[PDB]
């Protein structure tokens, strides 16, 4: 409820509103003005991205509290990263990540 | 100053709408979409419950929920691609050879 | 709380199975070898059994806020590991007939066994949900392993869509329970209630949606319709695993949840589970009556047998031997289903391709497979609850549990469903010995035959002499 | 923080209602992305900042991308279901709509009557979620890694082309 | 009048009812996934309504 916090909230709201309005108004002006007269490897890559992004979010949560988690948290994240790297090595070696076989 | 009942009711509304979409839609892709709506509503309910009690367990439940949602979405879309490649048809009623 | 070295030695089957998953994956990445990767998976599962011995040498304690290891956990972990080992043994000749990659099968079997172990040790809604999902997703892969075959792809799609819906139901019910009760541990689901206010509407509704998810997973009526389709369409070792390990692990975590939760002795939940048990017994036995397909028949059979187990669960808060009955019945059901689905797997192995039919054709099996016919008729007698078989010992335990708790409708349901089971089981067992007009050579097929023969001998011997099994299940006591 | 919650919840409800009754897959996925943005706004209104961040990052930013990838790869141009439009026929949707409405009334009746002092909205940071995640939920993290591994192996085995 | 055993017939009618009820219950196994989802949601409605009624 600080005045700095509410001022920054208002500034963020005005930033988003004015930015989206600027883009929309620029397209509106562009439209109104002026006269008139597949392979499955894409799925594989996107699916690998989704899986590795969820494992990335796990590491995202770990990274902000490494000191509070101590060495036992380091050991757990090391097991997590080793399993993730084993899966990555598996995908590379079986040709799943090889774009040109 | 938001009641827990309102967040839970919103999650129930989203769960019901996702289940309706899962039942009434004959396309397999829209069934998968309704499944995502259902599991996202469940994760929203867990977040509302955790934020009422002031505990981090609701967001951890959300994290496990979206890990399941990601993995089951990938599996379902792989099965959808296999069905389209085998039959050139996304009809969930046509894949019904096994019956009592 | 943290993880001590004592917590590490209690965690040993989970750690060994996870390390086996990593090692098998790295061996797959190094070179695609069927024999060595199957060997590594079965070595990891046997090492997990010996790890269960080492866990038994340690004490019973809570390894996490999430896990609790006791004799209950050791018993159901051992059941899951035995089912996984038998699935790998049955899977090798069937995969030898396969043409595509045949080691991701073993990776998925190991991950599903890891989920089974987690469900055996699950003391939390977190570990319950995660164990259910870790059972389910590798089974999505395994059920549609032969996706080029039409029936396997159809069973995969059905199981995937319905299990995603059931996991959504279970997760929403968990969220409602957590909304009512501020803790997610099993012991705390209903602690903040008193003076006869156990029937909180939100706690009951959350437990009902969890009942929807768990009753999908246990093939309980009215969440049972997927069972014959997924059982028939899946590969036969996958049918073995889905019949044994998934149901055993999920029903064990349902045991621990209803034993620990203070709302587990609610009258409304007891009546709803009694209705589901009655309907499951009657409906599964009635629906297996006119089945010419062996796998659909075993699916409806699983529906009825899980109804009997649910009857044993209903008396958990009234009698005392409910956990004992569930353990004995689950050991007997495990060995019976292992034998029956193993005969079905051995006669469907090697794989004949996605185009060729995979019909069992059990009529006249004795004239070319006499030992397999004897094993299958021992299983058919055991699943019928015939005395001299372990299935009768389980049925006797269920009947004693129901009689103690005065569950007369459930006892009559068991009697009626048992008579209907006698009809269709004896139909199969005597069709084994008739005459049919018309319609191996490696040690892994012989190993599968050894597995089903040892299952037959176990069923017969423990039906005649059930005292060692009763003594084993009695000392596998959970925390009171 | 109450106004934000109510408008975002209303936007989410309207968006999924337009998701389940739409015919074009890309339009349905777009309304689904809008619903996920609104639900992340609901998360931010309640103080679950990490949850809203992951809702945009992962759910609306990875999984919906996979859905859009699949839709543009299969090239749905009205394969006999757009021209049929069976889900908007009353005889098809009236049954499940009453069934879902009954389930909604039962669940909502269960929701009401529960004691409720209100959601405070105090922010639960990603710091505390990370502390819980690698503290009392270590096995959840490792077995969730194995779960995502299983999903990876299954989706590779099924979804590859050859 | 009794040459075709009447007591045997009135004791065999439970088998007839069993076959009829099994054939009737096998109509639910139509093999349609959308009906399976509908049946799960119907069972969810029934279980929730039973829990609210019984309390
Ligand atoms: C023979 C008849 C048929 C039996 C079928 C059984 C099927 C399930 C197989 C696994 C069952 C494991 C059950 C373990 C229950 C243990 C309960 C318990 O508390 O045991 C305690 C005991 C040590 O005693 P205590 O001094 O109390 O220790 C605690 C002191 N801090 O600790 C122990 O006793 C340790 C127990 C170790 C068990 C190791 C099992 C290895 C695998 C055996 C497989 C047998 C073959 C079955 C299948 C054949 C092929 C189909
Ligand atoms: C289709 C075939 C199967 C049919 C269904 C299964 C059997 C159904 C039997 C129904 C019994 C109804 C009992 C009604 C009262 C129950 C509550 C009660 O007060 O019970 C009395 C008593 C428990 O009270 P308590 O203080 O412990 O007294 C002990 C001394 N009696 O109770 C006891 O101590 C125990 C009571 C035992 C009751 C009888 C159990 C055996 C039944 C034999 C077979 C069924 C009847 C005959 C066949 C009918 C046609 C098939
Ligand atoms: C006097 C009253 C008091 C005493 C009651 C005592 C009850 C227990 C002892 C009596 C049990 C009577 C059972 C009667 C039916 C026997 C089974 C039978 O007839 O099987 C043969 C028949 C197959 O022959 P078919 O007709 O050619 O086959 C058509 C399908 N292909 O099979 C079929 O057609 C299908 C068979 C279905 C499964 C068997 C029937 C189960 C019925 C319920 C059993 C429990 C009954 C409880 C009491 C009921 C009322 C008396
Ligand atoms: C106006 C009528 C409708 C017009 C069309 C729709 C436009 C978008 C409407 C919804 C989004 C904006 C809602 C209004 C938010 C205004 C800011 C606000 O309420 O801030 C309060 C709170 C600040 O945080 P806190 O510190 O807790 O505040 C208490 C004081 N310390 O804030 C918070 O805690 C979090 C604030 C919300 C989260 C950020 C915004 C999320 C936006 C989601 C957009 C979804 C897609 C919209 C599509 C629109 C077109 C269909
Ligand atoms: C606070 C200082 C601690 C120093 C010692 C740290 C190392 C000892 C404790 C290690 C605990 C490791 C727990 C790992 C669990 C992995 C579970 C995997 C399941 C598949
Ligand atoms: C102790 C086990 C009891 C149940 C199993 C029964 C099977 C025993 C071993 C096989 C017996 C085969 C008998 C076949 C007889 C065929 C006769 C045909 C010509 C009349
Ligand atoms: C379609 C198959 C139907 C099978 C029905 C089986 C029914 C068995 C008989 C049940 C009898 C229950 C008697 C209960 C008496 C309770 C008395 C309580 C006194 C306080």
TrEMBL record, chain C:
Query: Which GO CC annotations does the UniProt entry carry?
Result: endomembrane system; plasma membrane
Keywords carried by this UniProt record = Cell membrane, Membrane, NAD, Oxidoreductase, Quinone, Translocase, Transmembrane, Transmembrane helix, Transport, Ubiquinone
Substrates-to-products reaction catalysed: a quinone + NADH + 5 H(+)(in) = a quinol + NAD(+) + 4 H(+)(out)
GO-annotated biological processes: ATP synthesis coupled electron transport
UniProt domain NADH:quinone oxidoreductase/Mrp antiporter transmembrane: residue ranges:
122-420
Membrane topology designation: Multi-pass membrane protein
* E.C. no: 7.1.1.-
Q: Does the keyword Membrane apply?
A: yes
Entry's localization field: Cell membrane; Endomembrane system; Membrane
UniProt-listed Pfam families: Proton_antipo_M
| Protein family (similarity comment) | Belongs to the complex I subunit 2 family.
Quaternary structure and interacting proteins, as annotated: NDH-1 is composed of 13 different subunits. Subunits NuoA, H, J, K, L, M, N constitute the membrane sector of the complex.
> Which NCBIfam families does this entry report, sorted A to Z?
NDH_I_N, PRK05777.1-1
What protein does this entry describe?
A: NADH-quinone oxidoreductase subunit N
TrEMBL record, chain D:
State the membrane topology. Answer: Multi-pass membrane protein
Q: Where in the cell is it found?
A: Cell membrane
Q: Which GO terms describe its cellular component?
A: plasma membrane
* Membrane-spanning ranges: 28-49, 56-74, 94-112, 133-158
This enzyme's EC code(s):
7.1.1.-
A GO term, aspect molecular function: NADH dehydrogenase (ubiquinone) activity
Q: Which InterPro entries match?
A: NADH_UbQ/plastoQ_OxRdtase_su6, Nuo/plastoQ_OxRdtase_6_NuoJ
Q: Name one Pfam family in it.
A: Oxidored_q3
* Entry keyword annotation includes Cell membrane: yes
Keywords on this record?
Cell membrane, Membrane, NAD, Quinone, Translocase, Transmembrane, Transmembrane helix, Ubiquinone
Entry keyword Hydrolase: no
The reaction(s) this protein catalyses = a quinone + NADH + 5 H(+)(in) = a quinol + NAD(+) + 4 H(+)(out)
Q: What class of enzyme is it?
A: translocase
The record ties this protein, via NCBIfam families, to: PRK06638.1-1
What the protein does? NDH-1 shuttles electrons from NADH, via FMN and iron-sulfur (Fe-S) centers, to quinones in the respiratory chain. The immediate electron acceptor for the enzyme in this species is believed to be ubiquinone. Couples the redox reaction to proton translocation (for every two electrons transferred, four hydrogen ions are translocated across the cytoplasmic membrane), and thus conserves the redox energy in a proton gradient. NDH-1 shuttles electrons from NADH, via FMN and iron-sulfur (Fe-S) centers, to quinones in the respiratory chain. Couples the redox reaction to proton translocation (for every two electrons transferred, four hydrogen ions are translocated across the cytoplasmic membrane), and thus conserves the redox energy in a proton gradient.
What is annotated about its quaternary structure and interactions?
Composed of 13 different subunits. Subunits NuoA, H, J, K, L, M, N constitute the membrane sector of the complex.
Family (UniProt): Belongs to the complex I subunit 6 family.
- What this protein is called in its record is NADH-quinone oxidoreductase subunit J
Q: Which organism is it from?
A: Escherichia coli O7:K1 (strain IAI39 / ExPEC)
Gene name, per UniProt, is: nuoJ
TrEMBL record, chain E:
Compartments, as annotated in UniProt: Cell inner membrane; Membrane
Show the stretches that span the lipid bilayer.
35-54
Q: Which domain of life is it from?
A: Bacteria
Q: What does this protein do?
A: NDH-1 shuttles electrons from NADH, via FMN and iron-sulfur (Fe-S) centers, to quinones in the respiratory chain. The immediate electron acceptor for the enzyme in this species is believed to be ubiquinone. Couples the redox reaction to proton translocation (for every two electrons transferred, four hydrogen ions are translocated across the cytoplasmic membrane), and thus conserves the redox energy in a proton gradient.
Q: How does it assemble?
A: Composed of 13 different subunits. Subunits NuoA, H, J, K, L, M, N constitute the membrane sector of the complex.
Family named by the database record: Belongs to the complex I subunit 5 family.
Q: What is this protein called?
A: NADH-quinone oxidoreductase subunit L
Q: Which organism is it from?
A: Escherichia coli
Organism lineage reads as: Bacteria, Pseudomonadati, Pseudomonadota, Gammaproteobacteria, Enterobacterales
Q: From which residue to which, out of the full length, is covered?
A: 559 to 613 of 613
């Amino acid at each position: 409820t600080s005045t700095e916090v509410i001022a920054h909230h208002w500034a963020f709201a005005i930033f988003l509103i004015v930015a989206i309005g600027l883009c929309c108004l620029m397209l509106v002006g562009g439209w109104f003005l002026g006269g008139r007269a597949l392979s499955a490897k894409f799925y594989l890559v996107a699916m690998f991205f989704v899986i590795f992004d969820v494992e990335a979010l796990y590491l995202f949560a770990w990274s902000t509290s490494i000191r509070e988690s101590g060495w036992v948290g380091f050991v757990e994240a090391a097991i997590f990263i080793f399993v993730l790297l084993a899966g990555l090595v598996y995908l590379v070696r079986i040709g799943a990540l090889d774009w040109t076989p | 100053m938001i009641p827990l009942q309102h967040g839970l009711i919103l999650a129930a509304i989203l769960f019901v709408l996702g289940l309706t979409g899962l039942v009434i839609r004959r396309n397999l892709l829209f069934m998968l979409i309704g499944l995502e709506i259902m599991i996202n509503a469940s994760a929203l309910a867990f977040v509302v419950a955790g934020s009422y009690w002031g505990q981090t367990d609701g967001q951890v439940m959300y994290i496990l929920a979206i890990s399941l949602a990601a993995a089951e979405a990938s599996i379902g879309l792989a099965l959808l691609l296999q069905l389209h490649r085998r039959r050139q048809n996304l009809n969930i009623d046509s894949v019904s050879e096994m019956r009592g | 709380m943290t993880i001590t070295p004592q917590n590490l030695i209690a965690l040993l089957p989970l750690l060994i199975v996870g390390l086996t998953v990593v090692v098998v994956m790295l061996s797959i990445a190094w070179r695609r070898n069927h024999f060595l990767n199957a060997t590594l998976s079965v070595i990891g599962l046997n090492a997990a059994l010996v790890s269960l011995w080492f866990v038994g040498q340690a004490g019973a304690m809570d390894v996490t806020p999430l896990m609790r290891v006791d004799g209950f956990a050791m018993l159901y972990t051992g059941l899951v590991l035995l089912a996984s080992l038998a699935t790998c043994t049955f899977a090798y000749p069937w995969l030898e007939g396969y043409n595509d990659n045949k080691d991701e099968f073993y990776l998925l079997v190991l991950i599903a066994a890891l989920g089974g172990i987690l469900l055996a040790n699950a003391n939390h809604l977190a570990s319950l949900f995660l164990g259910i999902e870790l059972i389910s997703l590798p089974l999505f892969g395994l059920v549609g392993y032969a996706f080029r075959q039409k029936r396997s792809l159809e069973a995969s799609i059905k199981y995937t869509i319905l299990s995603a819906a059931a996991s959504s139901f279970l997760l929403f019910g968990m969220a409602l329970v957590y909304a009512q009760s501020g803790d997610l541990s099993f012991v705390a689901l209903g602690k903040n209630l008193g003076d006869g206010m156990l029937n909180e509407p939100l706690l009951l509704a959350g437990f009902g949606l969890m009942i929807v998810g768990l009753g999908f997973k246990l093939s309980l009526v009215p969440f049972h319709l997927w069972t014959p389709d997924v059982y028939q369409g899946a590969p036969a070792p996958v049918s073995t695993f889905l019949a044994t390990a998934s149901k055993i692990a999920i029903f064990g975590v349902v045991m621990r949840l209803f034993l620990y939760a203070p709302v587990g002795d609610s009258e409304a939940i007891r009546v709803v589970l009694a209705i589901i048990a009655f309907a499951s017994i009657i409906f599964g036995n009635l629906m297996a009556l006119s089945q010419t397909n062996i796998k659909r028949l075993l699916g409806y059979s699983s529906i009825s047998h899980l109804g009997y187990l649910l009857v044993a669960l209903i008396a958990l808060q009234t009698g005392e031997m409910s956990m004992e009955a569930v353990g004995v019945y689950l050991a007997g059901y495990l060995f019976s289903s292992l034998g029956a689905f193993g005969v079905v797997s051995l006669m469907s192995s090697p794989y004949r391709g996605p185009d060729a039919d995979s019909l069992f054709s059990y009529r006249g099996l004795f004239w070319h497979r006499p030992i397999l016919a004897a094993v299958m008729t021992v299983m058919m007698l055991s699943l019928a609850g015939i005395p001299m078989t372990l299935g009768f010992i389980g049925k006797f335990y269920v009947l004693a549990v129901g009689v103690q708790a005065h569950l007369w409708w459930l006892v009559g349901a068991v009697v009626v469903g048992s008579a209907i089971g006698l009809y269709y089981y004896l139909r199969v067992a005597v069709s084994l010995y008739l005459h049919a007009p018309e319609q191996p050579s490696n040690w892994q097929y012989s190993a599968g035959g050894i597995v089903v023969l040892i299952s037959a001998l176990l069923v017969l011997v423990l039906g005649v002499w059930p005292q060692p099994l009763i003594s084993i299940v009695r000392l596998a006591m959970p925390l009171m | 923080m109450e106004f934000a919650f109510y408008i975002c919840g209303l936007i989410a409800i309207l968006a999924t209602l337009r998701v389940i009754t739409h015919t074009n897959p890309v339009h349905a996925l777009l309304y689904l992305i809008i619903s996920l943005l609104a639900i992340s706004g609901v998360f931010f209104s309640l103080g679950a900042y990490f949850a809203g961040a992951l809702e945009i990052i992962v759910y609306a930013g990875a999984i919906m991308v996979l859905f859009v990838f699949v839709v543009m790869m299969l090239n749905l141009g009205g394969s006999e279901i757009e021209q049929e439009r069976q889900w908007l026929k009353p005889q098809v949707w009236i049954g499940p709509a009453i069934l879902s409405a009954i389930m909604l009334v039962v669940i909502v009746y269960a929701i009401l009557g529960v004691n409720d002092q209100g959601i405070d909205g105090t922010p639960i940071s990603a710091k505390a979620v990370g502390i819980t995640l690698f503290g009392p939920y270590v096995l959840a993290v490792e077995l969730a890694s194995m779960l995502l591994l299983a999903g990876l192996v299954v989706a590779f085995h099924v979804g590859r082309e050859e | 009048l009794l040459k075709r055993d009447p007591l045997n017939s009135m004791m065999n009618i439970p088998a007839v009812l069993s076959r009829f009820a099994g054939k009737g219950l096998l109509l639910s196994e139509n093999g349609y996934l959308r009906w399976y989802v509908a049946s799960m949601s119907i069972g969810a409605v029934v279980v929730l309504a039973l829990l609210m009624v019984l309390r």
